[PDB]
């Protein structure tokens, strides 16, 4: 039983699903509902801005990757591992990684490859949880994610 993995997969898969289909999953989040719910809401807020702001960089990258099937998704995971290969980890890289995943997920749906969205979410979660588990733990997992992106209203 790996709660950190389960929670991460739940958050990331639901964002990619709702981005691809355009409809939220109105089931409540699983055990540990508070953190996961705020994490997904934060992901919508920050992730949507990332895709809007950087739609150019995302579109160019997707065009060159030429993603067509589940094989191209596994090759995609190879590129994603390089997100931390310079020794640096932060929430900005992690949210950008997930945002591109949603961008790819939308593309996978318009080419009638919705079956690859679930593998895509699992790959992203694998990269995060299986190679950066220690860093996530030190941040307090998705609680750290929520707090970092919380915007302070200091009047």
């Amino acid at each position: 039983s790996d709660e950190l993995y389960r929670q991460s997969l739940e958050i990331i898969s639901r964002y990619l699903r709702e981005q691809a289909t355009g409809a939220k999953d109105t089931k409540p989040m699983g055990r540990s509902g508070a953190t996961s719910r705020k994490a997904l809401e934060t992901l919508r807020r920050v992730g949507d801005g990332v895709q809007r702001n950087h739609e150019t960089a995302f579109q160019g990258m997707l065009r060159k990757l030429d993603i067509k099937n589940e094989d191209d998704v596994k090759s995609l995971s190879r590129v994603m591992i390089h997100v931390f290969s310079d020794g640096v980890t932060n929430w900005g890289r992690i949210v950008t990684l997930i945002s591109f995943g949603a961008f790819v997920a939308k593309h996978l749906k318009t080419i009638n490859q919705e079956s690859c969205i679930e593998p895509l979410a699992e790959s992203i979660t694998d990269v995060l949880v299986r190679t950066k588990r220690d860093w996530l733990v030190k941040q307090r997992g998705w609680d750290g994610f929520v707090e970092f992106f919380h915007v302070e209203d200091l009047e």
């Binding site: 990332v50 950087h54 590129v79 390089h82 310079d86 929430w91 900005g92 992690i94 950008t96």
Partner: peptide, 21 residues
């Protein structure tokens, strides 16, 4: 993988933006 650094840099831009929020 030659695109790797692009997303790292974009990620650091996003992180540096919120780092003052």
């Amino acid at each position: 993988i030659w695109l790797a650094q692009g997303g790292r840099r974009l990620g650091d831009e996003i992180n540096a933006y919120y780092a003052r929020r």
